[PDB]
């Protein structure tokens, strides 16, 4: 309805260029493009589960049997698998229901897109995307951004772009912030 209100980007490791060979802190790249055997496909599926949902919350009920079968028969790209995790009801209960739009922009960007918010203005900038278009459409555009297509092509599991001397997003961001802890004792 509205061209998303422009945000001012801040300097970040992901934005910067660097001529580095992979370190031991390299995020590790789970690519289904090679069409590896089923056993390695299990690792790739697990990494996507580990990214969209946190390692903490990926239990049996969280596991979608259909998704497990999806990424096994060289089906919809790993990107679409990520989107399926994102729009699944368990994700909406675990993340969307427990945070406000402004925090949701940050969480989804850190996990799905894999880069931190450029600034508070960007958190505001995409909050309306969540509101007007709907959360499903917000994650749709989040993984359909030109940035995403360059970052992880199609068959590459999302990873933190470059946490060079930086805390990993999973270990700095909880499932929900203390603001919702008002509903807890």
């Amino acid at each position: 309805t509205i061209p998303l209100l422009s945000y001012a980007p801040s300097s970040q490791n992901q934005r910067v260029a660097g001529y580095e060979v992979p370190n031991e802190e390299t995020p590790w790249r789970y690519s289904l493009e090679d069409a590896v055997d089923q056993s390695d496909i299990d690792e790739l599926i697990w990494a996507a589960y580990r990214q969209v949902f946190s390692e903490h919350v990926v239990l049996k009920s969280t596991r979608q049997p259909h998704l497990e079968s999806q990424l096994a028969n060289r089906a919809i790209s790993v990107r679409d698998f990520i989107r399926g995790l994102a729009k699944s009801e368990t994700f909406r209960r675990l993340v969307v229901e427990t945070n406000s739009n402004y925090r949701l922009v940050e969480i989804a960007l850190k996990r799905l897109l894999g880069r931190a918010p450029y600034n508070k203005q960007e958190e505001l900038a995409w909050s309306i995307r969540i509101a007007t278009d709907g959360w499903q459409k917000f994650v749709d555009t989040l993984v359909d951004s030109d940035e995403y297509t360059q970052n992880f092509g199609d068959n590459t599991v999302p990873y933190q772009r470059r946490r060079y001397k930086d805390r990993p997003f999973n270990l700095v961001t909880p499932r929900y912030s203390d603001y919702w802890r008002d509903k807890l004792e």
Partner: protein, 162 residues
């Protein structure tokens, strides 16, 4: 939580639209069934004390080894018997909560979530809970459509344990 009302609301929120007549029809059906649902919940909770103890004895009879051979996973000690009472009480309380909520939401959030993960770590055989829930499904003391609702939730738990 997976409550009928909230499920309709979330479905409308996905499409960013005011609540359409489809969702309103769904919640109307929930309200129409709520009379039988709440009466069933009352019946189960006011008979809860007998039910919990009966289920404990039922599992003790079906699996005598769970009462005799030593181990923390078993109720060989009075402390273990207390643990057994506590957990079967959890299941009964969750079923009443699901009955009043009108959906599987409560038991999915407070019980079924990660149930498999922990029942293997603490070595609590799911079959024990299966038999206990079967006893509760046989002695619930409900009748008619109230009974069908309660038994549906009980069997949801049974299938989840398996």
């Amino acid at each position: 939580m997976k409550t009928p009302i909230t499920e309709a609301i979330a479905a409308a929120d996905t499409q960013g639209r005011f609540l359409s007549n489809t969702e309103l029809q769904a919640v109307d059906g929930r309200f129409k069934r709520a009379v039988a649902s709440m009466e069933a919940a009352r019946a189960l909770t006011n008979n809860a004390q007998s039910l919990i103890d009966g289920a404990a004895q039922a599992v003790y009879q079906k699996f005598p080894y769970t009462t005799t051979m030593q181990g923390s996973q078993y109720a060989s000690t009075p402390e273990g018997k207390a643990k057994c009472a506590r957990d079967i009480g959890y299941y009964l309380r969750m079923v009443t909560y699901c009955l009043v909520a009108g959906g599987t939401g409560p038991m999915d959030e407070y019980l079924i979530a990660g149930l498999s993960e922990i029942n293997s770590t603490f070595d609590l055989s799911p079959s024990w809970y299966i038999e206990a829930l079967k006893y509760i499904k046989a002695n619930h003391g409900l009748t008619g459509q109230a009974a069908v609702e309660a038994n549906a939730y009980i069997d949801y738990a049974i299938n989840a344990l398996s």
